[PDB]
Amino acid sequence: IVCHTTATSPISAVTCPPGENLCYRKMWCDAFCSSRGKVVELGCAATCPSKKPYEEVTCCSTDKCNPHPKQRPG
């Protein structure tokens, strides 16, 4: 497992160095940014540290798994 996956091979296949799911998963890069970029910044977890009360990081344990932008049932 590495970065993006989306349930497939072409995607989940080598990207970031060793680590759990590789490529960490944050919410909106702290309270500051105002860079408007869908969701999360991504980079390289391999440990998914930091974390915060309102969650600023997450552990996927299965590749990027960024797909954090979702609205209503589906």
Swiss-Prot record:
Origin, by domain of life? Answer: Eukaryota
Expression across tissues is: Expressed by the venom gland.
Q: Does the keyword Acyltransferase apply?
A: no
Keyword Disulfide bond on entry: yes
**Disulfide topology:** 3-23, 16-44, 29-33, 48-59, 60-65
User: What are the entry keywords?
Assistant: Acetylcholine receptor inhibiting toxin, Disulfide bond, Ion channel impairing toxin, Neurotoxin, Postsynaptic neurotoxin, Secreted, Signal, Toxin
Question: Cellular component per GO?
Answer: extracellular region
What subcellular compartments does it reside in?
A: Secreted
Could you give a GO molecular-function term held by this entry? Answer: acetylcholine receptor inhibitor activity
The free-text function statement in the UniProt record for this protein reads: Binds with high affinity to muscular (tested on Torpedo marmorata, Kd=0.4 nM) and neuronal (tested on chimeric alpha-7/CHRNA7, Kd=0.95 nM) nicotinic acetylcholine receptor (nAChR) and inhibits acetylcholine from binding to the receptor, thereby impairing neuromuscular and neuronal transmission. It also shows an activity on GABA(A) receptors. It antagonises GABA-activated currents with high potency when tested on primary hippocampal neurons.
Q: What else is known?
A: Is identical to Alpha-bungarotoxin (A31) from B.candidus (AC Q7T3J2).
Q: How does it assemble?
A: Monomer in solution, homodimer in crystal state.
The family assignment reads: Belongs to the three-finger toxin family. Long-chain subfamily. Type II alpha-neurotoxin sub-subfamily.
Q: What is this protein called?
A: Alpha-bungarotoxin
The organism encoding this protein is Bungarus multicinctus
Covered range of the whole protein: 22 to 95 of 95
